[PDB]
Design goal:
Pathway (chain B): Pyrimidine metabolism; CTP biosynthesis via salvage pathway; CTP from cytidine: step 1/3; Pyrimidine metabolism; UMP biosynthesis via salvage pathway; UMP from uridine: step 1/1
CATH architecture of chain A: 3-Layer(aba) Sandwich
Largest interface: B-C, 18 and 18 residues
Structural class of chain A: alpha/beta
Catalytic activity (chain B): uridine + ATP = UMP + ADP + H(+); cytidine + ATP = CMP + ADP + H(+)
Number of strands of chain A: 7
EC number (chain B): 2.7.1.48
Helix content of chain A: 40-55%
Enzyme class (chain B): transferase
Strand content of chain A: 15-25%
CATH topology of chain A: Rossmann fold
Oligomer: homotetramer
CATH class of chain A: Alpha Beta
Protein name (chain B): Uridine-cytidine kinase 2
Amino acid sequence: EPFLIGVSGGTASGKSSVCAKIVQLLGQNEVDYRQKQVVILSQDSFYRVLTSEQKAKALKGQFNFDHPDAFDNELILKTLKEITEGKTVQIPVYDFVSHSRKEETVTVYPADVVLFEGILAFYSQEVRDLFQMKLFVDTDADTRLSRRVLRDISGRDLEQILSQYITFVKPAFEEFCLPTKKYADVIIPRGADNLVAINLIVQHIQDILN
Amino acid sequence: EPFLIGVSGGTASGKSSVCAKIVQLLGQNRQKQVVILSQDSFYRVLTSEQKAKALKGQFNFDHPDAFDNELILKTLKEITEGKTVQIPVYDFVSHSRKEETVTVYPADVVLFEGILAFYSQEVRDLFQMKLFVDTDADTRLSRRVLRDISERGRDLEQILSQYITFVKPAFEEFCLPTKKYADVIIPRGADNLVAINLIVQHIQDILN
Amino acid sequence: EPFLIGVSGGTASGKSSVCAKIVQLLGQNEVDYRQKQVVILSQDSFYRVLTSEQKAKALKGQFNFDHPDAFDNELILKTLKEITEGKTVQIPVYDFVSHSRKEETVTVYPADVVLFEGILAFYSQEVRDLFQMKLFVDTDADTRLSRRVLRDISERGRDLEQILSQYITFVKPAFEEFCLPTKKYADVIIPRGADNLVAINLIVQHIQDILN
Amino acid sequence: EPFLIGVSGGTASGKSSVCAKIVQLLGQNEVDYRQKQVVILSQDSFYRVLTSEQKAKALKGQFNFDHPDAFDNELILKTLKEITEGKTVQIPVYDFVSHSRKEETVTVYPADVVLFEGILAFYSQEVRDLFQMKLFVDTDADTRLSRRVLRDISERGRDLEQILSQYITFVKPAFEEFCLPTKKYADVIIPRGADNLVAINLIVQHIQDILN
């Protein structure tokens, strides 16, 4: 069966660039999406198709997408189990405009190793039990916020960014994400720039690939 | 027999505004019974060498070395002995001290505020009450950025670049570890009116 | 009318001794029961009467008494609202063997100042909003565990492996999951505990002002 | 050139058992002391030969061995760069009683992979930069106190109070002021310790890979 590696951390902690660089160093980008051995799956892709009431809160702008409720916990469990069985899965493409899923999906052919990363990857116990390796990218809220601002502004407004952060992100991260850090088997600090760490994991995957 | 109150915490944690609102609520805004001393006005006179670094934003104003600790210790001892004292007026444009000085007369209560007010054991032991305004690195950086940009007009990337390189390291290595010396911890900052009024009424009970 | 002060912190943090040394320094120990101006209430005396299944789990040492489910939140609310109404409240007495309340209940006459103390004093919004001042005694799990072990062998006659094993399995998780997160509602954080005299005298002098 | 792995964390965090388990799974335990490819060095072995004034403090039970000055950085630095140079080395043996090194030394023959394990392994830049991989075993302080109590009480038959008084007085301050701040120099953080098999197998295999 495929080797499932759960990766978590806060937004802009690097959990994404770390996964992106892992598959890259493994030369998976030079491989056709049809034969790929190592694939990256994002929790962001599994956003819940909002109900009437939820979109009414999002319309106003008070719907926290970092809250564990914003994620389709069941679809994620379903999808991961199916990939375990070695089957092929259909990863949905979210239409943030309508807050529904576009008809357009993403096909993920059975892979040897699967990297599932998200801010609440370890939140659900059933999802957490499916991972055979649990990694948490630990980066100070300090640095993360700094990274977050530079990214968003360079086209979001500075005031808006810090306001959404203080009002919604910080609180959601501290209440649901941070507490899951205790589930990790391995903690990777700083992120993408931690070369020694990245290579340790790419080598572990390589061995599995042989 | 002035009652010295030391107050620390990171910059942008609210320590200055807290001290401000504390004396403001006391209407103490020559005959002052409660005054505010800021560790800021005790920076060391910079050398022509360190000054060149400062104009290049290469000088760490948050490192203990940037403060004249001896002048702080001496100034605070004399205040404890009821002596009037002369606090310097720093001139950042020249990075040395201005000829003029602020005269502070013996007050019954003195509030010494600074990011490293609890750093030197000698200074620390002169405080009869030590307060630490504790706010999250998160919130703090946000306040710092908004202020640096909206009030001081700095470039965003330079604020964060410097924050990562100098402020954060300096805070974690020298400031944060002094928190354990506080008798009372005030969370969030200037908006914690319950805490603010707690120190007010207390400062008032001393004045009477 | 009564000034309600909510006090929290982890078991062993020193919250109890802090509250105790507060009334003591106020001379309230030398005051008469019927005339006491400041009194201390413990969330403890408000343990929930257990069901058949929870008692069963309790006999096997598996019911975490530090989980919020262990406290009778409803009664805590009603009792505190009455105290706000300047009414005389009747405090229940818990019997640990039967895991229920004895018929004997203690009476608390309307005092000017009430200190409500417990590990989950700020856990419920309703109870929390009743306090006009929120205090959290913050002592490192380190120091806290050290104190727990010492007091336990001596008075509780328990052994090390038991103390530590219960701490690892039940206290620590419950303290981190439920107590610690409520610290953010504190107006003032009192570190270390009852030996923080500067902090102690601060609350003591503030209370006296109220009494005057 | 030998691959140097620095391992740190607080005492009783699991750094020692993590290293012990690693070499064990690598079968190095059945290998002759002269045919070993991966060995373990303890900062512990490099305790510094104290002055007359420091044995005075040590005599009065006031010298903090968890302080960076209690470790001989020159000898550690010189010893490591020598293993680097592929040379053979002699690791001192300390009698933490007389506070001096014996004449009796342990022999370490050039190895492919070295594990330098210590509470202050990343404290000195000179030393820290020699490590190709830096690992920090992160374990909660209360959990660490739990293990320390059980271990210390079992062997030295030291009275509980001594163990804790010392901990609060010297161990804790030292850990927080000098060890913890070095965790930011780690490349990988291994939580909890010896029972973290996944992290363990991770390092084991990587080592194996180097050995081929």
